[PDB]
Amino acid sequence: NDLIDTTEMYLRTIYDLEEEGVVPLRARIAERLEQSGPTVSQTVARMERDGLLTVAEDRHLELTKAGRARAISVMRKHRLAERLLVDVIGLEWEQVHLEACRWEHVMSEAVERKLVKLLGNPTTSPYGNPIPGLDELGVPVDTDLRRVDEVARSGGGRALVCRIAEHVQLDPDLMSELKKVGVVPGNEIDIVAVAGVNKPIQVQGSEGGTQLQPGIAHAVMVRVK
Template identity: 45%
Template sequence: MAELIDPIGMSLRIILECEEDRVPPIGARLSERLSRSAPTVSRMVERMTRDGLVSTDPRRHLILSPRGRRQATTVLRKHRLAEVLLVRVLGVPYEHAHAEADQFQHVMSERAEAVLYERLGRPGVSPYGNPIPGLSGIGGPRSAGRRPRGEHRLADAAPVSRAVVTRICESAQEDAGLLHALRAGRDVEVQRAPDGVLLTAAGGEVHLPYALARAVHVVRA
């Protein structure tokens, strides 16, 4: 990852994404996703705690304060709106839009967000199928859309089945090869492999280790 423009905003966003993905938000997750050393992340956590943005529970999980949650929601909303803009309007390849949106999210004002939201047709999800949070803050609905009925993690799919990809979590969007082969809304054939899942899709075959298969959600075709 390139030099971070706003490491605190990125850290708060990642904590919120972990909550969304039902993954424990701990310092190691920040270190992994930000490509930063454990001591650097520890200093950021200390600063966020001092600023009243997060706290830690007895298991060392990071807990967003109301203020921290508002800030995290704003950053994640900008990020996902930027992804929609990049893919739909600017034609950035699907597999690169997530990384580019990391930069766009830092230069978007709330006024620009509101205009962009309307110009894009008031989208509710990112190109990767993830709900855009906090839309009420820019004139949208108060609640995000519900997840599709029967949605489950790819890692929990039947040994051999057909499925439709509903969303690709943020933690998997760093893998450009995965994004090249998979799209939200794409039909796939799922087969279990000894160390993960083998998918057959329009882009060919792709092998996902279980760590990535847990970050892709599907419904039965």
């Protein structure tokens, strides 16, 4: 699959991992962008050379000031594009991320400002993800939010769906399933209890239930009632 811009996608993959509370290693970029170990290390070396990140002693990737600024810029464009596609153009909910994944690379700051006004200063994507770096475009606590997997291991119960991470949005067939049964932002779900890590978590939405994989359940954030 074509990344359109390699540098921007590497930066945004590091941002995604930080948002999901996962350590940003080159091994993560390899499995997510589906590129070889040698390819990722070489591309990270060019970005380190250009001064957009640094590799720590424990191998974890750290964004520079320029790197973080660029990552936020790309993510802002992504989630503004997703808003436009849902609210105005009316592209189907499951296909919006894929489209926005390409648009984030071609959108100017000029258009971003026009979109902020057209969309009424949106603060979240259609998947509940906060839109960052609005300060440079001329414009909640998030502590109470817990991961579906961590809730299930801790006892389970009822909770309100708040965020679906970028990682989850890549699979349109899954996003079609989540919409069908009703695991969407602003809907209540019942999270069945499990014991230990790497266990498929069961959830019961408004129009039925389904099974989330450990990496999918970890990516969905909720507020327990």
